[PDB]
Amino acid sequence: DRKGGSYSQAAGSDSAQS
Amino acid sequence: GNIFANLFKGLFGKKEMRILMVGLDAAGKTTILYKLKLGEIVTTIPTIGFNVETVEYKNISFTVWDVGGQDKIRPLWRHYFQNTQGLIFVVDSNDRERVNEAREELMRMLAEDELRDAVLLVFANKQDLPNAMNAAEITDKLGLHSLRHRNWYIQATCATSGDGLYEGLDWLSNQLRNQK
Amino acid sequence: SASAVYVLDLKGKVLICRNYRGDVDMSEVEHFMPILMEKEEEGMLSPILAHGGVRFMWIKHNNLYLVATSKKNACVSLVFSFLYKVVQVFSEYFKELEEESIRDNFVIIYELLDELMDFGYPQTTDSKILQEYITQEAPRPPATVTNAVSWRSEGIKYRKNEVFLDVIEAVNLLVSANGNVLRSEIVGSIKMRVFLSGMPELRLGLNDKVLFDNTGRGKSKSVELEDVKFHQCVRLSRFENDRTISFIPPDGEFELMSYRLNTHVKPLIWIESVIEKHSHSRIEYMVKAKSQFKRRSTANNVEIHIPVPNDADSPKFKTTVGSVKWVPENSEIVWSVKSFPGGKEYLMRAHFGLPSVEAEDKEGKPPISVKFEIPYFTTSGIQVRYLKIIEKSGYQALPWVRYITQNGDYQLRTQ
Amino acid sequence: EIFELKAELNSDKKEKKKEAVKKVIASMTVGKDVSALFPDVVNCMQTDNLELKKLVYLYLMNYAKSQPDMAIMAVNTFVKDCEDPNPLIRALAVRTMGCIRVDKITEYLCEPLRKCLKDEDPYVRKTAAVCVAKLHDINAQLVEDQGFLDTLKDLISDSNPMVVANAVAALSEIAES
Ligand SMILES: Nc1nc2c(ncn2[C@@H]2O[C@H](COP(=O)(O)OP(=O)(O)OP(=O)(O)O)[C@@H](O)[C@H]2O)c(=O)[nH]1
Ligand SMILES: [Mg+2]
Incomplete structure (x- = not known):
């Protein structure tokens, strides 16, 4: 864990915008 | 104390030695230094400052510091007088007009009390044209026989050919090194 | 156009100086200290001093004044930027900023x-780039400085490609003594700690209001950042054209983008303070804190600083939740809370005596400031969409980022 | 102290030369007038170690106006170093040449400046642009005689954005004066 909000995975781009 | 390390170093060679370079400007001193260190004729401008190098031959690290004979740089030769053991004089036999100035400069520099243990070392420069004299006429003109307590030897070296430098180096080593 | 940047000390001794133009004598630094003493003693002290025709611009460092003398009408902003870059470089190279x-x-x-x-013109400012040519424990200058990419060194290889992002929130609230909030601004901060192999070119995409409107998706929750400032690696042309956030990430932690816009929402913490200060007899601290944040969020390490009297002594604390410690150095009471769940309501009742002798001069009314920091909370609602990580060789990246909400300029005017 | 430092600097050991240079740098930073030993450090100037060359150049720059006469024994070293294969050495030499506030020293540095004007290294290009601006500020007439305005103007139309920006800044400073 880590204070200040746990790290979360991010995407590569807006898949819904083509 | 023990001197075993000194003997071990001397068994393979430990002495290095030093040398100095003085004389009139544009006398091939830079070319002579390049031939002694590298062995090639490199084109160089007038020595506004100075060039210092070392020469490795016969297990002796002969440090050479080329110094010009410019009017603003002639008095600067006293800076090299500190921690100096050798000295080489480059003569310009093709420059008759500057011969008297070179002789006066040598007399003024040769009258320095700090430089007493250094033997005479004159390089017979300008050995490329018939106007170059012999090894006795130059010595007679410079009055090298009147230098009391000075071990002077005349050696003629040609910058273009590179000959005569080995004899001068051997003479300098014999004068400095008194061993077998 | 500073003539020479020097590093001074707290006693007036110059730690280090380096002339760049030589138009000003180095002896002018001696007169800087008396001028600063006179200006401070008369209230005319300013960071940019002036010794006749030469201006002595200096900034206060951790322990020394970074004084940069100048003679002509040089770029003061350029001098400040150079000083900031030098300070950042010193902090990167030296972990401590002191005389040691x-x-x-x-x-x-x-x-x-x-x-x-x-010659007064800064040339090198990359701390990582400068560390490749100047070390305290030299080769030719790197081609990255000569190359266009001066913020992404080529040839970097890593076993893994992991980048740690940081969604840092800054909650600044200016609540007047009348009970109304005047300055309520939230400054975003998109800082990423990139550690990958090669020179990846990040392709950032988030839930921006302008981008959603341009794409036609201006109907969901999108952040409308009043001020958006990209980092050095960020290409201005791409953002100017179609809000295309394409830039080469640096090696290490860096600030890519920093949002800055006003906030029209209620404060995350509602603090109501009461002052039952008797006339030289006693004082009352009717401090009431209401958590306006969501109940699912907890404010870790909450420190609501309540300024107590300057000469107050013998305090008694009657609170409900959170430890209260009176620090004489700060001359205030810190409503310290380890974890504050959203919607919590903590009531405190301070009570201390006062000396019989009245004070000779007034002390002022410093504002009440809290030190709340609730991570994993996005008040602005801006959601990151994607980060285009592209490499010439080709690799599968695993980016990471955390959203942290803290208390910034959240000061409350005293009554 | 001073005599011991001079004796150490007049030795053939690099380990003691480095310590002597560090001590001299500390004394000058501590507020000690070490300009009296400037001629002694002149002999121990042409060194292969890069760390001592920077210290020697800094001492010469800081001890140039104080002892302008003794600075005449540094033109040869600068000329020799102006062609070093290492770009860092060339940049340092270019920076040190313009930092010497000697009226008779900038006259002999025009040839190295002209040679380095077309330097391929972008850092070398920036260093030459800074040196040209420094020479023009020191001597506008000397800069005009050397004809460096055309080279500075042509610098903006070449590659190396950092070098181009440096050349533009130098041109603006020259036009500013
Ligand atoms: N033709 C010819 N000229 C020579 C010869 N040796 C020396 N010189 C001349 O001597 C001059 C000196 O050249 P350098 O040796 O490079 O410089 P220097 O002897 O140190 O003289 P300064 O640099 O002025 O102190 C050259 O310009 C040559 O013209 C030679 O063997 N043949
Ligand atoms: Mg020469």
């Missing part, structure tokens, strides 16, 4: 000062 390191690394300090700027 100024006199300890002068051998590399002189080389760094010579390389950074020449």
Whole structure:
């Protein structure tokens, strides 16, 4: 864990915008 | 104390030695230094400052510091007088007009009390044209026989050919090194 | 156009100086200290001093005044930027900013000062790039400085490609003594700690209001950042054209983008303070804190600073939740809370005596400031969409980022 | 102290030369007038170690106006170093040449400046642009005689954005004065 909000995975781009 | 390390170093060679370079400007001193260190004729401008190098031959690290004979740089030769053991004089036999100035400069520099243990070392420069004299006429003109307590030897070296430098180096080593 | 940037000390001794133009004598630094003393004693002290026709611009560092003298009408902003870059470089190279390191690394300090700027024109500012040519423990200058990409060194290889992002929130609230909030601004901060192999070119995409409107998706929750400032690696042209956030990430932690816009929402913490201060008899601290944040969020390490009287002594604390410690150095009471769940309501009742003798001069009414920091909370609602990580060789990246909400300029005017 | 430092600097050991240079740098930073030993450090100037060359150049720059007469024994070293294969050495030499406030020293540095004007290294290009601006500020007439305005103007139309920006800044400073 880590204070200040746990790290979360991010995407590569807006898949819904083509 | 023990001197075993000194003997071990001397068994393979430990002495290095030093040398100095003085004389009139544009006398091939830079070319002579390049031939002694590298062995090639490199084109160089007038020595506004100075060039210092070392020469490795016969297990002796002969440090050479080329110094010009410019009017603003002639008095600067006293800076090299500190921690100096050798000295080489480059003569310009093709420059008759500057011969008297070179002789006066040598007399003024040769009258320095700090430089007493250094033997005479004159390089017979300008050995490329018939106007170059012999090894006795130059010595007679410079009055090298009147230098009391000075071990002077005349050696003629040609910058273009590179000959005569080995004899001068051997003479300098014999004068400095008194061993077998 | 500073003539020479120097590093001074707290006693007026110059830790290190380096002339760049030579138009000002080095002896003018001696008159800087008396001028500063006179200005401070008369209230005319300013960061940019002026000794006749020469201006002595200096900034207060951790322990020394970074004084940069100048003679002509040089770029003061340029001098400030150069000083900030030098401070950042010193912080990166030296972990401490004090006299212990100024006199300890002068051998590399002189080389760094010579390389950074020449003739008053700064030349090198990349701390990582400068660390590849100037070290305290030299090869040719790197081609990255000569190349266009001066913020992404080529040839970097890593076993894994992991980048740690940081969604840092800054909650600044200016609540007047009348009970109304005047300055309520939230400054975003998109800082990423990139550690990958090669020179990846990040392709950032988030839930921006302008981008959603342009794409036609201006109907969901999108952040409308009043001020959006990209980092050095961020290409201005791409953002100017169609909000295309394409840039080469640096090696390490860096600030890519920093949102800055006003907030029209209620404060995350509602603090109501009461002052039952008797006339030289006693004082009352009717401090009530209401958590306006969501109940699912907890404010870790909450420290609501309540300024107590300057001469107050013998305090008694009657609170409900959170430890209260009176620090005489700060002359205030810190409503310290370890974890504050959203919607919590903590009531405190301070009570202390006062000396019989009245004070000779007034002390003022400093504002009440809290130190709340609730991570994993996005008040602005801006959601990151994607980060285009592309490499010439080709690799599968695993980016990471955390959203942290803290208390910034959240001051409350006293009554 | 001073005699011991001079004796150490007049030795053939690099380990003691480095310590002597560090001590001299510390004394100058501590506020000690070490300009009296400037001629002694002149002999120990042409060194292969890069760390001592920077210290020697800094001492010469800081001891140039104080002892302008003794600075005449540094033109040869600068000329020799102006062609070093290492770009860092060339940049340092270019920076040190313009930092010497000697009226008779900038006259002999025009040839190295002209040679380095077309330097391929972008850092070398920036260093030459800074040196040209420094020479023009020191001597506008000398800069005009050397004809460096055309080279500075042509610098903006070449590659190396950092070098181009440096050349533009130098041109603006020259036009500013
Ligand atoms: N033709 C010819 N000229 C020579 C010869 N040796 C020396 N010179 C001349 O001597 C001059 C000196 O050249 P350098 O040796 O490079 O410089 P220097 O002897 O140190 O003289 P300064 O640099 O002025 O102190 C050259 O310009 C040559 O013209 C030679 O063997 N043949
Ligand atoms: Mg020469």
